[PDB]
Design a protein around this ligand. Structure first.
Ligand SMILES: [Fe+3]
Ligand SMILES: [Fe+3]
Ligand SMILES: [Fe+3]
Ligand SMILES: [Fe+3]
Lengths: 340, 340, 340, 340
């Protein structure tokens, strides 16, 4: 736009030299709505499974985590600009020692059992459908107490933490439930020893039973004409820090959704990214108007503001995570729902 | 203290006439520490039981609630300056219709079963050891679905509400658990339909099982050298609003305590008043240095700043309520513990 | 209502003996809406002035505070069930030493100058129109550095504190502004040494200039078609704790109102009590439909739920206090405005 | 680390194909402490001034903002991974129309006067030393009402917002103070029309007078042995949202520091990045042990965890901004101070 003269050419040479970038050569710095580099994308469980198994064979140098890498993120191990999501495959009888990092993490168990993660010394047992938390700066290491492999998903705010410069890092009992649990998993009850609120949840594991039980009660209530479901046919719970009522960790939200056969959700645009895993059943997602059929274990990502919706063919169980707590804490969250 | 002359006598006559009270005739208006009019006092269950039964016979004009009246409160139906506590005796097959008041209330079940309280249309079943809430401004009425009597304690902030000028008042399914429960009583799980925080809990009933289960896990943890108990031998839980982590109602705190045989608590002075009921077991209280032996069902009151302590002879279960949420919300709470 | 037999007469005798009051002899314990014992009432400044002066003569046993006593409160020194309001008359060159109580207090200066209140060692100068705070548990004593009398209003939560059992009590520089002020009275600016939030304000004095300046800018904005005034003609500010944005003290709200000549406010019923003083100008109040004409210095009380409204004859300046922070903190507040 | 065989080579080929990155080829993803790509860097005012002037000549295609670009950020217009900082040079009588974006912004005036920024229709006048806010989603455009150039610094959370996918964007009175100001800039006073808390400040401009006045009172208090300064010789204020007590905008912190001649601050490592501008006086910074001498108008950046300290030769005034509110909101903040 400026007259392209010698004097202007010399101004630009100076800019380059002095680490100045002018804004009138730039516009894309401030878009009309979010326009992620991350792309909607789906990973087929049967693929992730075979490559995780192969890894088990070829790499006893575990540790053995297959990071889902968004194709739009320039080769980084990021499923989105905020979140890492990986499949970790732990072999017969293997272990890891204790470390801590400021990054927040959860481990959601896909299939397997009889593995403990020891969180600040407290052994939390792991099982199909259990969500475990390793909040930032909690020592954690684990041990398989069985000849069997186990596969969980590993969800961290690694990409947020690497880009915002926030990372820090430092370096065999098998009880049936952890201390956290025995203390914190009684509904509406708070131990007088834990009257202090906490930034992350003290619940070590949100066991599948409770999740399943909750979702089913929401479906029964619909049948009985009671308010419960978020949308018709759509039962759903958010995993929460019980000291607070709020999200499990400062950076990550986790939920679980159960759709009744035939249910189709209304299209949402939400700010920030979310990942889903199909825990059980069959159905599809629509992202940017594109339908992708979905089987058990499949995972997919919905970057900021991508219009999305889900359809349950059978009864569709889906575990969910997002960076919504980052967007909400900073007043950046916005939501568009069809017909509202 | 002023020279007692005619002119001074005339000043006072004017004060009287003009509704002025001078402060130099007064001192007791601002005491060194709280000095309640309410007095520590104990009510023997066997007394409350026989008079409740007699009431059942003589008064089918129920409704039939025996208010514990502190001897120091000038004939008012107040167990303390903030709280009402009464025994309500509901007879074979009887009912009450729905009303609401701004005063907050709970009903803690002593012995009986098969009575529902219908809270805003949602029937909450009642049972030995269950705490039910009827938060302020929730419609509530009840029905006995059995030939049997039931006795619960009725705890309200009536005395606070009458003295601070805050009162307002307006005028058969038997399901096993209420909606609130089926929605809210799953540990660490929050329904997406209830992401709004609430001022009082949405848990209709805190059932005995959970309370018992929690307390027992705290005792087992002590045995195993884990932190859990508030004090050695002293297990304890606070009943909480799960949206928030905080107290059940804005004005009332409820807790439940379980002391291991032989445990003696350290003497506390706490600001505000508290009531205890012995749910199970035997032991004593010390209030103002005076030991009173205690049997199952006995109730007692500890006015603001009265030094108190409890001793478990057998294993001592005790349900608790207080006005602590009023003191804490207004920054008035103070605590003295022996050896701290 | 029960059949009046011997056996019933014997039940009642037992009740009396065992400190039981049955609820079916009672109803008035839970009213349709608040029905205070406190009565609306007005005190004429010229009365309060002459009796304060007389006190100055007859009682050098100062200290010399004339408590406004509501006629409905059974002889207690309470202007309402929550608040004390008194006129303190400090004579030529007199002083008081330092004490503290948990009760919260302010001193609003009516006429006078050149008196300091020393709040935790920090001398806060006092002047016509200044609101000073002595938050609960802050040491405070004062000194007149002039041959002149001064009269301020003394507002405390004494009645709340005596009835709820919350009271505790323990036993010459003249700088132009206090430390608090020099630190805290710069708009939108917070000292890095005071990043901790506080329960009561650290502003020692809210000087008249700022109050006057604020109110006048709200009136000028109305003239210019800008939003500012709360109601048309009605300018108004709340005094606030700057660490927090909220009320000055946990128990007391203070505001200042300026009505343009001719303005009549809409009738309000508000829960809890409020006191007003006419700082400047002439007008009337309507309480329970009864109009009382009002001159400079006059004070009046509006108990919980009494319908009230104000009319400015000239431009009507009015200082305000209430127990609203107690009602709001406990979710007891309700408001009815005419035409809304 | 795995045996480099055909079968392993084939596993990797699959990874590439399926958008899987394994974590055992990676480590740098989770560093011992933050290790920014952004580099500490200094921009000399006299450079920024001459290039801004040149821009004024060569580019009447304004708009005319010179973005400070960190040398470590791969050619992006980011002074840090969270913040943009630019010099905007507005020429004789020029203007911009109204737009809004979700990104948060301030404009801190370096030299100039008689320019208004119109924030949601409210004209805020601009002047040497004034901080103005254009919080996210507030319409803003401006106009120079004078023949003179003006230069301000333009601080936005553009880099955070572009990387986290949060951006949205939509498309002559000269009063002496804005409405916001006339309403909000009275110390400890809150208009009854603005009892709602706000996420960003409603103060349009934090004028130099108040900042200067505050800082000077903190220095006078030190002289008088009163607590005020954060560190000896170091006076300082945080700009704050008065509804809340907290930071001006959800994403950006602003402060102003005044060091007494000779003062040297203790070395800090803080998480997240900060920018400083020298408003007045002379001195140096030490970043990573490297001393850089500093003149009036110079700007410098301290990425996450870079040890930094400042030395005042004369009396050293410095305006400050950071992403600390992002770190604090997400529990990521950590601080190391020498000798603590
Ligand atoms: Fe880890
Ligand atoms: Fe009732
Ligand atoms: Fe006092
Ligand atoms: Fe802009």
């Amino acid at each position: 736009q400026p007259k392209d003269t010698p004097e202007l050419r010399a101004l630009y040479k100076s800019f380059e030299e002095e680490s100045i970038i002018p804004l009138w050569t730039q516009g894309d710095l401030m878009p009309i709505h979010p326009k992620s580099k991350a792309v909607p994308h789906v990973w087929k469980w049967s693929t992730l499974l075979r490559l995780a198994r192969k890894s088990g064979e070829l790499v006893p140098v575990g540790r053995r985590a297959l990071g889902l890498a968004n194709p739009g993120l320039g080769g980084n191990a990021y499923i989105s600009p905020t979140m890492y999501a990986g499949i970790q495959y732990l072999g017969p009888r293997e272990t890891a020692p204790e470390h801590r990092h400021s990054q927040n993490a959860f481990r959601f168990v896909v299939e397997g059992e009889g593995v403990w993660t020891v969180v600040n010394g407290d052994p939390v047992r792991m099982s199909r459908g259990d969500l475990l938390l390793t909040p930032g700066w909690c020592f954690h290491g684990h041990m398989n107490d069985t000849d069997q492999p186990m596969a969980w998903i590993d969800g961290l705010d690694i990409p947020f933490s690497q880009q915002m410069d926030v990372g820090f890092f430092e370096f065999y009992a098998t009880p049936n439930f952890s201390r956290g649990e025995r203390l914190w998993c009684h509904p509406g009850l708070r131990p007088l020893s834990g009257l202090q609120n906490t930034v992350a949840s003290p619940i070590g594991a949100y066991r599948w039973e409770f999740t399943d039980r909750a979702l089913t009660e929401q479906l029964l209530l619909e049948d009985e004409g009671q308010p419960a479901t978020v949308a018709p046919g759509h039962a759903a719970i958010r995993y929460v820090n019980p000291t607070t009522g709020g999200d499990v960790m400062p950076t990550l939200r986790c939920e679980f959704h159960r759709l009744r056969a035939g249910t189709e959700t209304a299209t949402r645009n939400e700010v920030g990214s979310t990942v889903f895993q199909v825990f059980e059943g069959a159905g599809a997602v629509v992202m940017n108007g594109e339908t992708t059929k979905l089987e058990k274990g499949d995972m997919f990502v919905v970057p900021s503001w991508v219009p999305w919706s889900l359809q349950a063919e059978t009864q569709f169980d889906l575990f969910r995570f997002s960076d919504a707590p980052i967007m909400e804490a900073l007043s950046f969250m916005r939501t568009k729902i069809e017909g509202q």
